[PDB]
């Protein structure tokens, strides 16, 4: 369902790690960067900037024990940590 999502609104350290990894990979594959490259050449550092600015174009499918799932977007998730 769209609403009634029972999982946390915060981004977990595992979600953050994979988001940065997969985005950094795309960057290293010469994908378009959605933030200004302020002297940044390191895919990971670049990805972290996008994370801070919530520019990372991804959605986390959180699978629940019974096979069902809740889709949360990067923008929705609270990148605290």
């Amino acid at each position: 369902p769209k609403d009634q999502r029972a999982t946390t609104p915060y981004m977990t350290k595992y979600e953050r790690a994979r988001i940065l990894g997969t985005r950094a990979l795309q960057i290293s594959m010469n994908a378009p960067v959605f933030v200004d490259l302020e002297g940044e050449t390191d895919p990971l550092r670049i990805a972290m900037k996008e994370l801070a600015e919530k520019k990372i174009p991804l959605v986390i499918r959180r699978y629940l024990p019974d096979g069902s799932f809740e889709d949360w977007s990067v923008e929705e998730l609270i990148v605290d940590l």
């Binding site: 795309q26 594959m29 010469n30 994908a31 378009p32 960067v33 959605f34 174009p57 959605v59």
Partner: peptide, 26 residues
């Protein structure tokens, strides 16, 4: 959004599957 760099030309024609790594750099 206005960031045209976020939109894939092939995706416009349904040539890109945003939820598949087979498409790649979405």
């Amino acid at each position: 959004p206005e960031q045209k760099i976020t939109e894939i030309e092939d995706g416009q024609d349904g040539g890109v599957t945003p939820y598949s790594n087979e498409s790649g750099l979405v």
